[model samples]
Target chain A: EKLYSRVLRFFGIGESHLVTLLHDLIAEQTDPTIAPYAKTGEVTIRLSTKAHRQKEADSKLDKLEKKIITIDNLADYFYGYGEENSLPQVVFDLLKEKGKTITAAESLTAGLFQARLADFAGASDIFKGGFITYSIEEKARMLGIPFEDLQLHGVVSAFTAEKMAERSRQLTQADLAISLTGVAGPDSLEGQPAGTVFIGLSSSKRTMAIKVLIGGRSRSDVRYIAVLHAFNLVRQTLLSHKNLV
Target chain B: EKLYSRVLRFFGIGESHLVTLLHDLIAEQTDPTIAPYAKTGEVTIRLSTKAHRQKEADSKLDKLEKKIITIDNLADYFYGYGEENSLPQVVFDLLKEKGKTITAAESLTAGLFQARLADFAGASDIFKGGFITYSIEEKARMLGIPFEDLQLHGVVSAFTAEKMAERSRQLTQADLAISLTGVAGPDSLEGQPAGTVFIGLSSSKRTMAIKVLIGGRSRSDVRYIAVLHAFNLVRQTLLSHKNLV
Candidate 1:
């Protein structure tokens, strides 16, 4: 809900106009169940791919998604690919098909990353459990990052975020680890402005933090954008590495 | 703070004064820098060891964590467990040592499950993204569940919940998955009582749903408790699983 507002505001829509537009859309959609949380401005759509018709479904969703994005200036707002090209869902399917596992270490958005993933059906095979270390001490003590590094780099720094990502894979005994460290605030921390996020993706093979600057109004708004950024980053990374020719 | 109230209400605590009593005890322990969030209940303590410790520094916390239940009234709220009984830190360390990935599927409380897990520093490693299939159509369409089943067995029924769990694992392609479905209610659903929750866990080998009768006044409270239960269930499954063993 909040994410929608932030994303909308990021596109320079004022509160009154955004609210009116959302109301009008909801009125027209006439489907309460489809976007029940529209008051929050964020929505997740489901697109099915049949066993044999999977490619076809993917193609259809791909086209519809482009049209949906065009409905609003959402080229920057919606981060992940189209419905069929959903990188997170696709990668998770690949990992499960291959019998792999992964873990998480979140800072900016709490359990949201895993929670959104778990919102799917049959996530148990891939998800064990996760940690919620929202502070530096926990990041160091629970994640086993060096204390000196945490103190020097700070919780929102690229160094801490990457280490946290690697450590998550290690701690969970997972093939991959992902971490989100960022500022979501009415105030900045460590000189980083609010909505400054560093998403770290770590495998035993490689690790990196893609930095994003999301501008939003409040704590909830910044947090929402941060979580969205985290998923898009994960999806992009996985797609980039999945079937490297 | 809200969770504390929920816990209190869960135990039938009388008077807002009891909260004040607890609040002062907490305030005395926490530094001023963290006092505001603590007072507002935005912060939480994580019990990291099986042995008991009353150190003030140890009690000052940032992550809200699970409360261990006990036959003894206060035992349920106690931080320290018996020595060598359980090592969450060690378990986390082992996950780090191994290379696995995990995902989730959430229905009832939306994306709260992932929100909680992503708080950990390294969640992204094993933390693949998830789905928020809050509607029956979304569930069937996104995860390949039978939409007709919702009519056969209500959304709150164990039947649909189990299917949700089973589908989560199959769709995510991870070693484990968790599925949540329920009426975390301001009102009942399909004649089921409010707080009637069914959580599903799936692995390559096993799939099951645990029925939870939640009790809460507000919609958020019921959802919070439900998501918390999902987290605990995942942790328990991880601890008990032989494949991981």
Candidate 2:
């Protein structure tokens, strides 16, 4: 007998939601060792089978992946189905190959998004580096965030994320930049509830911010989700711009 | 039958080294299911026995913790042995109870040290904020890192970490401050190899930095270890100053 496991990674969805989607299918499986586990913002389904039939195990995972409409729609965000088990590594490889550089400005996620990119080997090639403007004053000082905007719109707005991304790109002179500003909180910020997130992306072609309401999640959960979304934005941008140059 | 697992968290040590230290003891165990897993900078030992006694399992784990002299000596750094599974959560709780405010300035660790603290609830009270000066220019621009120091000692030096910590404390008026700078690399920085780290700590009492050589570890491992050391410094500081005004 041989043991085989297949991990399907997902983002933008809850583990409980995935379990609900696959619980019946998992229950119906003849293999008693099919196990699903969740962490951070990713979920893995571990399947074990007798015999050294790796192809069969993969086929089973493929069928399962097809069953989830959410996964099917998010084919690009679904990492680990391929060789890499993470987003940063994949993004790093792509960015390096394209000779495109990146930077970041973060608030709620602190330095996590940049730190994560730096966690990949050869990251220094594509990652020019960025900022963790954790304080409102530092945000204004480092990234040229307007004090009036911070006071009026508050620091947790799409406006702040946009400026952060734009400023970081200009600061590092990178080909691309991403910024995250959010409330990863036990307490609300500027009347906004916990889990209110803004992920901004900047390139020569376009600049935009994503408003993500991840309300009711824990501080860590909110931060992790914001990071994931920022990563996805990078991946999506690269994918969409692969043939541009 | 009762199943037991004990996770031993270590800092300033490699996972393979920990395994080598405990392999003999682990091999001697007759438990049918004994598994050792390594991640980032920590290791976990999972032991299962087909007996209905939890005490035996506890005793076995106790012996293992004792066998590793490095771990034995650094008992304070070993987190989650009794209650918590992570350092940030435990440190957050402690700092909160003591009404201590904190800040950080990061380079190699990016914003991870701050982000990890922000991961827990009510972190805003103790974690006033910090900076992620990923670039040398930002280091000087944001935290007032001296130009001569950057040119003389370089960004990865203990001098940089100390200055980062001290400046961040002063910038945020935080009760405590920590700074990290190093190479988490496929490439070296300032001739320093990957996993070379300097963690700086600043408080009312003292300002200091620790030099850690974690070469041969991955970028994630180096970053993770740097964060661990930073947290340990905070924990030790609090412990030593519990009676101090």
Candidate 3:
């Protein structure tokens, strides 16, 4: 009652904005009038000493609390900066400007490349979609890559990677395409090094592949780096000014 | 007999894969080797701790059971961040080399022209979506802004906002479009005070009510003055630069 009475006196809240104590910041708020308060729920708050010492802020609060005489004036702050991570922005900026759409074929990345790109709220517009050809058979059958090539040049080779990119572009009817196949690993793949990988990007003008060797303590980390490399290459292709095919 | 032997091997799966744990993780596992263990409930997990600090981490884990894991990974992270907040390099660099394709309109932010060009992932590829009417009849007749405008506009000025840039562009086969409306207030409308708003965007442009300013305090000191004034405009403007279709 002491706390309640003090609050009521501060802002001089009328009988209408009934006082209630609530906690939790991002939870769904059913209180029809407004979002619930951001309750860091602490007795003391820190302030910038350069602007005003803690004591000064505290004293200001103390005086206001004494003068307001009601809770009506109290409300949620509802303001602050959040996090900033930038990678997708790079891709979208390019894709949106060119009206170019893309598709992908993946081996170790599975469908992660597609899954990640789809996270953009409006991706349905530029992202025609992708395929996850996890096995040699799927790559051959679904994307129409030459089945004999996987055995001839090997699944982890640039030859296979290039074909996958070519086939994915045709299958998805995309303006451009990319493909990945190789081991992101804890162990060697087909006698190749553990991190042996190949990635390819293709358009009507050109089909290309690059061999990448990733080094990381864990397979997950290696896979992440591989994806990063793959997308970065994709981004590079889109940004090329020379039509260098 | 063949199935039984495989099942036994599955339960004996070593620590590395934890692969067999999936057998117990979800409700549907029928491997013969693991079936008996599931029925008898006699298996034990061996946990080895690498450090004493793990105990404290374990306690911390208990308190963090409800933490929201961002289902939005790097791709989405990149995409959403770029679309809503910043310029992503991968997407940007790519689109720049390809070509430019996109468009838009602005009103409430009159003379603050193209302010929408700030903070986005790729304002190059997919942004081509925008409109900022900032008035009622203009929104309704120009972009086909609707009637409920009366209710929401009561809080701000639906007449001024209903721009629906995206929907309008959809008619022309533009790739993306958006609309922004509301009051950046220091006063009242329809007897309602400031700080109300709305913003909408589309790829196949069409007009739609973006925002309706509902309520708030002083014109200069409105709750969302800076936010509504800046970020929304940036998003829309940058979107305009994208090559949608």
Using lDDT as the measure, the top candidate is 2
Scanning candidate 3 chain B in windows of ten residues, the lowest lDDT window is: B1-10
The residue ranges of model 2 lying beyond 4 angstroms of the native Cα positions read: A1-83, A185-194, A215-217, A241-245, B1-81, B185-194, B204-206, B241-245
List model 2's recovered fraction of native interface contacts, to 2 decimals: 0.57
Report lDDT per candidate: 0.58, 0.74, 0.46
Q: Compared to the true structure, candidate 1 yields what TM-score?
A: 0.42
Score candidate 3 by DockQ.
0.02
Clashing pairs in 2: A111-B111
Per TM-score, the best of the predicted structures is 2
Q: Is 1 or 2 the stronger prediction by lDDT?
A: 2
Q: Looking at candidate 3, what is the lDDT of residue A234?
A: 68
Per-residue lDDT of model 2, residues A208-229, tens digit only: 8999888777777788778888
Separate DockQ for every predicted complex: 0.10, 0.36, 0.02
lDDT of candidate 2 vs native?
0.74
Compare the candidates by DockQ and give the number of the best one: 2
Give me the runs in candidate 3 sitting further than 4 Å from their true place. A1-83, B1-245
